[PDB]
């Protein structure tokens, strides 16, 4: 989940900002070395601010188009039922004329 | 579009069916009606026009001409047709012994994994003095048949193509009595026939091919069986001459193949037919040449052609060097050639 990855990376930046400067750089070298280790082993880590934000933006856009597709289809179905009742009342009035 | 050519259908067969042959009368001498080659490409020629009454009379005229590589074809069979109230129908066919590997590849579909058994019992029937049956079939053809066709195959092993399967076709024998044409075919068995033998100089013919399928950008657009009529053979080249593209006007010893070879085809070493104008089909494709059904009605036919030269600059670019000799002479010496030497 991109949201879960965002939460994890937010916790990561809070920890980085809380720890002191010399060991900012020390632990930073540490997770870079380990990052290279598991990613070279093959574990594709997913930690990039722009990439995750743009993935979330794509998901939100997909949801928006889907909601619009709802509104169109639902309005069409309601229109169909309304029309059916409309000619039913039409034909009842025709019978009353007859 | 024209209603005679719609709906747009794919060509059922990649070869191309001849359908109609010229009408037969017994009075002419015997002759085959068809031949096959492969579209190699086209070049440019300039010609001293000999059309009286034309604006460009006795002037240089530049034309585009198709080259068809035409290796000698081998006669491997005769067929006898009988006329019936339901049309013509195959009465009986006779084959030849020692059928070629390539015609056997035509008879087969998966040649690499099949043990070569086709026509083996037929060759045995020839070999074991069933000449009784052989002469029986020939006598049946002579007695009951009115139309005879020679089965002839063209030879990829001489053509410069990655293909290895031969090309077969039936070619009618006209101009003579049925017995005469059957004897002529019987003589023809197991002998190559040249395009000098089938066709001849400066003459009008018909050409059958399958026009290219324009695929991958209401339906099939392309790959259509087309017989284009009225195309004039201007030249027949010999392969072995090496002065094929050479013309009397320029004594430049070169073959019909331009610098670098034909693009996407190669280099031709055989008999070839050089015909005027654009012609249906593409390169490497089988081209079916045949005689006109009717005697000609224009001076364009029986107009004799005199050539000047044939474009042999590399068609892979905008070259202007006909021969490697003149090219290496004009460019002079280069540093890479000097270092090699």
């Amino acid at each position: 989940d991109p949201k879960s990855a965002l939460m994890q990376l937010e916790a990561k930046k809070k920890r980085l900002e809380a720890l002191p400067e010399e060991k900012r750089k020390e632990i930073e070298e540490k997770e870079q070395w380990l990052a290279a280790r598991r990613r070279a082993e093959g574990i594709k880590v997913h930690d990039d601010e722009s990439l995750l934000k743009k993935a979330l933006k794509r998901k939100e856009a997909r949801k928006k188009k889907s909601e619009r597709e709802w509104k169109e289809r639902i309005k069409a179905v309601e229109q169909s039922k309304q029309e059916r009742q409309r000619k039913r009342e039409e034909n009842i009035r025709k019978r009353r004329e007859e | 579009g024209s209603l005679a050519f719609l709906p747009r259908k794919r060509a059922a067969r990649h070869r191309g069916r001849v359908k109609s042959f010229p009408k037969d009368d017994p009075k002419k001498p015997v002759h085959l009606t068809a031949a096959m080659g492969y579209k190699a490409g086209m070049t440019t020629i300039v010609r001293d026009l000999d059309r009286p009454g034309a604006k460009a009379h006795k002037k240089e005229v530049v034309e585009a001409v198709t080259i068809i590589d035409c290796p000698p074809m081998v006669v491997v069979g005769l067929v006898g047709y009988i006329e019936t109230p339901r049309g013509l129908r195959s009465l009986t066919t006779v084959w030849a012994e020692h059928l070629s590997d390539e015609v056997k590849r035509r008879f087969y579909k998966n040649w690499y994994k099949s043990k070569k058994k086709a026509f083996t019992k037929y060759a045995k029937k020839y070999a074991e003095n069933n000449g009784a049956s052989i002469t029986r079939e020939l006598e049946r053809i002579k007695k009951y048949c009115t139309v005879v066709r020679v089965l002839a195959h063209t030879q990829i092993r001489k053509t410069p193509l990655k293909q290895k399967k031969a090309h077969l076709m039936e070619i009618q024998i006209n101009g003579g009595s049925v017995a005469d044409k059957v004897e002529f075919g019987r003589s023809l068995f197991e002998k190559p026939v040249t395009i000098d033998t089938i066709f001849e100089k400066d003459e009008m013919i018909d050409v059958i091919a399958v026009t290219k399928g324009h695929g991958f950008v209401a339906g099939q657009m392309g790959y259509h069986h087309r017989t284009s009529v009225n195309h004039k053979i201007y030249r027949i080249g010999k392969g072995d001459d090496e002065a094929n593209a050479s013309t009397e006007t320029d004594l430049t010893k070169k073959k019909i193949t331009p610098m670098g070879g034909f693009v996407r085809y190669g280099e031709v070493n055989n008999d070839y037919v050089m015909i005027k104008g654009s012609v249906p089909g593409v390169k490497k494709r089988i081209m079916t040449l045949r005689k006109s059904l009717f005697t000609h009605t224009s001076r364009k036919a029986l107009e004799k052609v005199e050539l000047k030269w044939i474009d042999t600059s590399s068609e892979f670019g905008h070259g202007a060097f006909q021969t490697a000799a003149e090219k290496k002479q004009f460019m002079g010496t280069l540093k890479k050639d000097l270092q090699t030497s």
């Binding site: 870079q32 070395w33 280790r37 990613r39 | -």
Partner: protein, 233 residues
């Protein structure tokens, strides 16, 4: 696991580097693109965007500086890491074959990748000097172990086992040594003396590597360890 060898790192290429890269590709067969023809207008972006859909996991880049120094950049697609080795001494496969009394031509063995053998690299802590061991050497081991496909001794056909790739470290676990990387290639010949004798024949190329520098990404990222330049905190 697929790897490609490219000369795009150098501004221009010559016969020596071309032969070296051809030999490296021959070593990398069959998991490499032999017909990769480098063009001057190409770039690292084009090559990585080709690696993307091609599923290539590793990329060797042979660069040549204006001074004539040659560098080998081993990068893992498509986001790094990057390892900068410097060329100290190199020999061509043709020269190796000429020097060898009985050179063996490559054959059906092109179908099988070489087994990686790794010597003198220190994985466990011996002096707690973690900066070289626990930062550089483990990454080296993982990088090459991923460069070559994982080897399961319990399923690999011994008759297919024909090539070996040697990586010998001139360095001691006490962080004392010349820190030199020795890359070599050998062909296996099995002779019946079951007792079988294994004879290894040089195939080349011989490679003298200086572990110069490292990057997190594809030719990008912070310098994690540079031998000559240590950045302050």
């Amino acid at each position: 696991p697929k790897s490609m060898v490219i000369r795009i790192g150098a501004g221009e290429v010559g016969t020596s580097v071309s032969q070296l890269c051809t030999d490296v590709r021959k070593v990398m067969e069959p998991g490499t693109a032999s017909r990769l023809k480098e063009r001057k207008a190409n770039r690292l972006r084009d090559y990585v965007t080709m690696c993307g859909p091609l599923g290539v996991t590793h990329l060797l880049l042979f660069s040549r500086s204006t001074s004539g120094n040659v560098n080998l950049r081993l990068v893992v697609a498509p986001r790094g890491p990057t390892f900068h080795f410097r060329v100290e001494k190199y020999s061509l496969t043709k020269d190796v074959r000429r020097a060898q009394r009985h050179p063996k031509g490559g054959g059906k063995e092109y179908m099988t990748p070489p087994l990686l053998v790794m010597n003198n690299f220190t994985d466990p802590k011996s002096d707690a000097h973690s900066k070289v061991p626990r930062h550089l050497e483990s990454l080296t081991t993982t990088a090459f172990q991923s460069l070559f496909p994982p080897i399961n001794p319990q399923t690999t056909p011994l008759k297919s086992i024909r090539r070996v790739l040697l990586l010998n470290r001139e360095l001691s676990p006490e962080n004392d040594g010349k820190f030199v990387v020795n890359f070599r290639h050998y062909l296996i010949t099995t002779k019946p003396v079951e007792r079988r004798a294994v004879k290894l024949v040089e195939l080349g190329p011989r490679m003298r590597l200086r572990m110069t520098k490292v990057e997190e990404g594809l030719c990008s990222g912070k310098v994690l360890w540079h031998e000559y330049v240590s950045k302050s905190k």
